[PDB]
Amino acid sequence: EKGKPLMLNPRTNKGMAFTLQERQMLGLQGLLPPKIETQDIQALRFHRNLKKMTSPLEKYIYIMGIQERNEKLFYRILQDDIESLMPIVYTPTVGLACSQYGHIFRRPKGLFISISDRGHVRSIVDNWPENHVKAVVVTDGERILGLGDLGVYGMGIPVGKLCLYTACAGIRPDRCLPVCIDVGTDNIALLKDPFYMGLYQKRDRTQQYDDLIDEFMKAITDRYGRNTLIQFEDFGNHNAFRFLRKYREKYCTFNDDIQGTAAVALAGLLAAQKVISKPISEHKILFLGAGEAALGIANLIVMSMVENGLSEQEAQKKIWMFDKYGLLVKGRKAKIDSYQEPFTHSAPESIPDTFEDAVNILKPSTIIGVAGAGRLFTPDVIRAMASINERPVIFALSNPTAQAECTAEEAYTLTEGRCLFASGSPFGPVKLTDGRVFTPGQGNNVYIFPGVALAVILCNTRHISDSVFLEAAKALTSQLTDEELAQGRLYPPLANIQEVSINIAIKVTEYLYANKMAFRYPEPEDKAKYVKERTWRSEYDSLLPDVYEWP
Amino acid sequence: EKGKPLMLNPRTNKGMAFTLQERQMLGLQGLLPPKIETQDIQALRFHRNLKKMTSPLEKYIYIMGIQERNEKLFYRILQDDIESLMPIVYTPTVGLACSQYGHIFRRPKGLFISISDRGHVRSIVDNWPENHVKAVVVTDGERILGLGDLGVYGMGIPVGKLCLYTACAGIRPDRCLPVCIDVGTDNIALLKDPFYMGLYQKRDRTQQYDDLIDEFMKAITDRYGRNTLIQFEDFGNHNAFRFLRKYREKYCTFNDDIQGTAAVALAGLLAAQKVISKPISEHKILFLGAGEAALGIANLIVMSMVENGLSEQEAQKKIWMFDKYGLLVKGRKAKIDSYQEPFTHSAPESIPDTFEDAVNILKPSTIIGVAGAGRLFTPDVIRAMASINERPVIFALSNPTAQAECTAEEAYTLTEGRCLFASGSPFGPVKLTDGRVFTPGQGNNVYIFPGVALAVILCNTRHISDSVFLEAAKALTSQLTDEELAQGRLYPPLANIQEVSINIAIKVTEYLYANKMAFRYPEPEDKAKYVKERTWRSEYDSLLPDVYEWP
Amino acid sequence: EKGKPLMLNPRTNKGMAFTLQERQMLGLQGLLPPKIETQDIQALRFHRNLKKMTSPLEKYIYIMGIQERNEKLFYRILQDDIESLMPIVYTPTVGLACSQYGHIFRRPKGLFISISDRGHVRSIVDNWPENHVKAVVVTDGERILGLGDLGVYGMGIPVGKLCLYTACAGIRPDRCLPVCIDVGTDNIALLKDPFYMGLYQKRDRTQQYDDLIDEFMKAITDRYGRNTLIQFEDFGNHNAFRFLRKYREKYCTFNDDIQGTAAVALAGLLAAQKVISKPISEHKILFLGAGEAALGIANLIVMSMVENGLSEQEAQKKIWMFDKYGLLVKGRKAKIDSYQEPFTHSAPESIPDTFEDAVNILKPSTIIGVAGAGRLFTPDVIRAMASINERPVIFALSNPTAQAECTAEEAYTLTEGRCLFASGSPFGPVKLTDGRVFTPGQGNNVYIFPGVALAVILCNTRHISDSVFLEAAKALTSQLTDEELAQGRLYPPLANIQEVSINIAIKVTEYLYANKMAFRYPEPEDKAKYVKERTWRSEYDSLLPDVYEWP
């Protein structure tokens, strides 16, 4: 393009970083302020402005405003201050922004697909400008993290997620497509006000919803290829869990809550087996809550035990689960699903109804809380957990902070610094009365899903297996240095996630090429250089055409 | 255009007012939320949101945000609530927004012309997309109303001014071009910070500034025609006053502060001569401050007296002026300019140094304050003014409110409701202890410059005369009904300015065709229908192409 | 535009005349052959290629091919060799090309409007890209000069005509719009073959045809303005003659056959009155054939006599007409139209049935043949014409050459060089046996309609009067030098028509401003400079944007 469109397009826009020659010979002279800046000056200006701001919503509005103007500047700002701005971009700020401000974006981002557009989804998909997209993030709006049902307003969530894809992994922004599929909303507040921009109907729970999802996946893979990575995001637990099982084999789909969270938990455990002398195989594990997330975590733990020489049937005997009714045992009154069968064992002597006595009798070395029904972990639970184990491992993986079973202060005060605590929700460092300030391990999916997504995209993988996340967990555990392990950190520092994500991608890429899951040939000689070439870089590219004089 | 560009262009964007057929056959299906709205729903949504907001800056950011997305919706919102949103758009909110937020706009508006771009201004002008523009507003940034020197940040002022052109007069938005000519800045705050987007030099006061203005006017009239209306806005008093004299004859230029303010003051006086039985000719007038603004007001008053039968030399004897040094009289110690000569008369007996004794001895029937050095009108001045005259006329035309000579409460309390008070600055209604709440006449240029601009544009006028504003003042006085005159209102209500402006245009148009100042031929048979057809209307236009089946 | 579109657009295409810098910085590097040429080299190449060609059809195909590739080069080639290439472009070559080759053009030229598109003509007109067009040429296809009914294939005729507008007058190519209105065809050859691209119906002679013409004119003047010049070209004689009368007052329409031919004939007579001592007023004129063309010529001759002091009723007594039945006299058996009444006089003594005895008895000084029924002028007619008059004036204005009444050889051999012969059809020089080679005056409309069209366009004239063509005829007679008059030439040389046309425009422009028929104000001080600035010039314009370095 030339002239004004070149400024309007966020991909090609440089702002006042257009050099004088580019302005003069591209038609931008007089349309821009006289100052000529670099990308550093532009980044410093926005960093100072963000530092002046005091609330996450103001920062979110500011950064999402600069995203629509200059994308390279936006990602430069993100990568410059990724640790601080990542909560502003993805969680929990974007959900709250969708709740309060509604629709913030001034430009068409992604595709809105209705239940009224059934039978014609391919026509909608054909409207997207970019011909090659590699990653698709789909939102229903039903279950926003901590905000509930937001209807069609939950479109900012995929945008915030794809921002993390580009900022951490390096996936090209134009290869990403955010999609919102709206079938109504259940909350009455949006159904009542006349200015809600979605359908004025309750959420469609009939077969039309399933058919719409089928048609959408078929259309998107028809236009963009069978290896397109499709991620179902903020669907209902029922919908997301069953959709992953349905589309797992036919399409390239992976779920962060089931699989990314399992990878993060396994990485935390593999780091704990380095902090503590005893390995992962020896120590018994107890799960609070039995569900698809708990089953995924336990399956991945069993895989990790198996690759270390333990028999699969023997490895499963170590993992214990605590359902809502009680300990998951043979002969239990409540029904046990087929998937929960491997981890259901012969009943112990006590057969305890309460989780506390289950901890007391089973003597679990590791405790993992995924139930997310509240503060299920109690001070009695934690002191008991300390009683059996010299260095107990406590995981509170359910988020938001309200749903988390344990708090960092509770874990580090009930146990006088002996425990290893890892939680999905962010917690401040705990300062004991004696001293020895402890920062609790905070493991979120952003460690896993960017690098895994990049590795899957680069290798043209069509089916993502469970062991891909095992390799991702091992890779993530690998970047921890011995000094950090001495400090007791379970996860790599979040300030340098990019170098983490790329490294993870490398390892995953190698695995994908080792087991014939990668369809991009010829095989790279070395995977590190291969992935490092492909990552998108936010540096501006000169638009000056080559000018010379003929000999 | 088709597809995504159709949404990105503010001129052609409809938002969710795109009908389903337009979305389907224009490529917008899936790029817009499923809801289909009308222009009324969109206007109500923004009106409610603006009503929720509590500060002028928030409202300004919101409305200028919707301007960049949908221009027809923006002007519909303005015309719906013109009285409330006009201070938000033009004064004093836009200057304060430029002061605090800097550059708000996310899209290229107008042209930035540097002193470093001398010799190549035509190349800059050629970069503007629209081939036909009728009105150009030029800002220097030197003298923002109440904020001082803002440098290149004073670009929002022409945008806010052109918004009033389109909202009140009905001039097409694409016919307007805002231009900022930046030659440096004098304030050290902008010269010190590294993120100022202008030139890092003090304001260029040399001959290069004059040559740049000459070159800019030549280039703009070369590209867009000699009848292009060019308005110098927020220049320094010296620069603006001398530029109007220099370019008045060669180009189509008019100045609101010199000529629009004079028209508003004369309209107020012509309305007072209806409120008070005695006419304009009889009553003596005293001016506080002698300058180009005061000279313009006095010249226009003399013209009004002359058209009513009074001799010009005899009419000039009635207007008196009070310079900074003292009463403007023969033999005065201080120099008297050539332009101030007609209103300089033989000295009275007292020859008073102070303004108070000048009022006491001259017995002025009307007092007009344009000096703007502060609260020059004192309680003693106002009680004296009441002493001579049963119904004194007091004008405090200098703005901002700080620079205004008098306050509405002072005028209406020192004079027990007898005075007629008109001021440029807005004042709340005055409630006396006895009762009889008085609203002070508030006459701003927005009465005059939209209608006069529309009339000049429609008739292809090349030279705007002084008597055009005399006709505008008479027209503005005409819309006042007898009920409003009984209420004591000097100006028409501001809530229905559009019907005022069009009416003014009509009258001005007639005058332009009466005196061979209009170059658009053939002459319209009736001017009212002629102007009413031409005004831009904010109603959306269907983009459905005509579809039929051949016989 | 930039890159490949810049080459594809004929308006902006330069071919290999793009300089190396333009190619490099406009994206054309590698898309063009390495050679860099000028406007002269390109013109010389095409001139040599045309000189190699031997038939008019090959030349027509070649030049109309270069028109679609480079318009500036095409018009440079035309203006370089206008006399030779004008018959190739307009007449009689383009009609024969439409007859044989059908549709030659590879690009959309003009608009095709059907009788099946009635009720929606404005939708068709809105499809034309150019927003400002000044001249519109409309063809029906019914009466092609010498080829008969060609149906929709007669679309090349307006294109060839507008080529003459641009080449001779200098009207901008993008201001011209060729329109073909097809209502069927009468010839069975086109109705029979399955590949005819028009309607498969006989020509619509019902009221729908008239309504379609009305709707088309209304739509075209609605989109492009009331002063748009619309020219009905190659309509049937009935249709064209009645349409000129119907739309003459309401729209800006003029007809070459009625009015241009009359202007050319009057110019020839005014040149003859310089070649022969006696003036136009003295000499009696006899017309062969009485019709709208003959009535137009006679009316214009009467106007010329009147402006020279002769009374209108007395001037009309000199012009005589010979209808099909016989001499046009009082009491004639055949009906006489209202328009033919002024030139119908009291019967002479003979009242001759044959044209020959009419010449013998009336003793006409001038004879004009417009009937076009064949070789109506006979050797007996010409020898009789020589018998009465020492230097007879013979005009054979009907074309093609087959329809012409007289031949140059017949006129110059039956009269031993004494006669002055002017004909519409082209004739070679006549070489008598004694010697004194005589070239016959060849007066075609191309003398008149380009200059008159340019003058009408420049002055924004809304109604073209009859006396405009009187001024055009006088102007055309004026360029003849005394040397050419001594040579006996009735018309200026055709090799320098451009300097003729511009001159004609000048004079016409002056007349339009003298009689308040011109609506473009302010009035130019001198009309010559005014028109000379406005003429389109075929010189290439550099596309290099201005590049400089800031001080």
Ligand SMILES: NC(=O)c1ccc[n+]([C@@H]2O[C@H](COP(=O)([O-])OP(=O)(O)OC[C@H]3O[C@@H](n4cnc5c(N)ncnc54)[C@H](O)[C@@H]3O)[C@@H](O)[C@H]2O)c1
């Ligand atoms: N100015 C530009 O925007 C520009 C210029 C040149 C090339 N490209 C891109 O290079 C691509 C060529 O593909 P390739 O030769 O690199 O294939 P590849 O063999 O290197 O990689 C295999 C797959 O990985 C995809 N991929 C590679 N890098 C990616 C990234 N950073 N983010 C998301 N997906 C990525 C590729 O699209 C490809 O499908 C073009 O299709 C085009 O998308 C873009």
Ligand SMILES: NC(=O)c1ccc[n+]([C@@H]2O[C@H](COP(=O)([O-])OP(=O)(O)OC[C@H]3O[C@@H](n4cnc5c(N)ncnc54)[C@H](O)[C@@H]3O)[C@@H](O)[C@H]2O)c1
């Ligand atoms: N996106 C994430 O961060 C993420 C990912 C995975 C898991 N989780 C967490 O997992 C937990 C639930 O996920 P899920 O997939 O298992 O949902 P689910 O619907 O599949 O099942 C939830 C399980 O929790 C058990 N449970 C509920 N209340 C209990 C109680 N008071 N006492 C004991 N057990 C109880 C139930 O037996 C049930 O099986 C939540 O904390 C959730 O936030 C979060």
Ligand SMILES: NC(=O)c1ccc[n+]([C@@H]2O[C@H](COP(=O)([O-])OP(=O)(O)OC[C@H]3O[C@@H](n4cnc5c(N)ncnc54)[C@H](O)[C@@H]3O)[C@@H](O)[C@H]2O)c1
């Ligand atoms: N979809 C569109 O945007 C669209 C469609 C048709 C016509 N137009 C406009 O109509 C114009 C035709 O001019 P005209 O026949 O009306 O001239 P006119 O004789 O009616 O008026 C004379 C002058 O007044 C100008 N003018 C008229 N209305 C104006 C307005 N509301 N705001 C600012 N200037 C105005 C005109 O540009 C013209 O120069 C086109 O040049 C084009 O600008 C726009």
Ligand SMILES: NC(=O)c1ccc[n+]([C@@H]2O[C@H](COP(=O)([O-])OP(=O)(O)OC[C@H]3O[C@@H](n4cnc5c(N)ncnc54)[C@H](O)[C@@H]3O)[C@@H](O)[C@H]2O)c1
């Ligand atoms: N844009 C507007 O709203 C507008 C328009 C016209 C005039 N004004 C007002 O006119 C007044 C000045 O405008 P100007 O064009 O005359 O400026 P100016 O520079 O041309 O001259 C100002 C005049 O004010 C006189 N003066 C200054 N201080 C005085 C004092 N203490 N006592 C008596 N006289 C004093 C001076 O003699 C001087 O002649 C200001 O209130 C200004 O705000 C405002």
Ligand SMILES: NC(=O)c1ccc[n+]([C@@H]2O[C@H](COP(=O)([O-])OP(=O)(O)OC[C@H]3O[C@@H](n4cnc5c(N)ncnc54)[C@H](O)[C@@H]3O)[C@@H](O)[C@H]2O)c1
């Ligand atoms: N690169 C370009 O193509 C380019 C650049 C600048 C201006 N222009 C043209 O100049 C026009 C400005 O009009 P103006 O100021 O000259 O009006 P004008 O006062 O000079 O003339 C009056 C009328 O004559 C018309 N006209 C003038 N010259 C003509 C020509 N050679 N052929 C056909 N019609 C002609 C004009 O369109 C106008 O309507 C623009 O509308 C635009 O059409 C074109």
Ligand SMILES: NC(=O)c1ccc[n+]([C@@H]2O[C@H](COP(=O)([O-])OP(=O)(O)OC[C@H]3O[C@@H](n4cnc5c(N)ncnc54)[C@H](O)[C@@H]3O)[C@@H](O)[C@H]2O)c1
């Ligand atoms: N485009 C041009 O070059 C042009 C322009 C004007 C006139 N003409 C010529 O004018 C002549 C006809 O044009 P028109 O407008 O008068 O058509 P028309 O239909 O209006 O009338 C033709 C006239 O010719 C008369 N006529 C026909 N045959 C005759 C005959 N054998 N003897 C005597 N008179 C006869 C008839 O009385 C009739 O009135 C043709 O030569 C035609 O080519 C040509």
Ligand SMILES: O=C(O)c1cc2ccccc2c(Cc2c(O)c(C(=O)O)cc3ccccc23)c1O
């Ligand atoms: O990158 C871009 O396309 C970009 C485009 C711009 C266009 C015009 C003016 C400033 C621009 C800036 C800098 C900038 C800003 O961006 C912002 C903002 O975004 O709020 C505010 C500014 C305030 C004062 C000065 C500069 C500011 C940009 O960076």
Ligand SMILES: O=C(O)c1cc2ccccc2c(Cc2c(O)c(C(=O)O)cc3ccccc23)c1O
């Ligand atoms: O006109 C336009 O082009 C326009 C374009 C839109 C595109 C997508 C969504 C809403 C749009 C709205 C409505 C709208 C808004 O415009 C805004 C806003 O402007 O802040 C906020 C909204 C919040 C919730 C729902 C609708 C909102 C528009 O009007």
Ligand SMILES: O=C(O)c1cc2ccccc2c(Cc2c(O)c(C(=O)O)cc3ccccc23)c1O
């Ligand atoms: O003006 C133009 O856009 C133009 C565009 C051209 C593009 C490619 C090659 C020649 C071009 C020529 C020159 C040219 C020709 O044009 C033609 C032709 O037109 O038949 C034939 C050629 C044969 C040999 C060499 C050059 C010839 C042009 O002029």
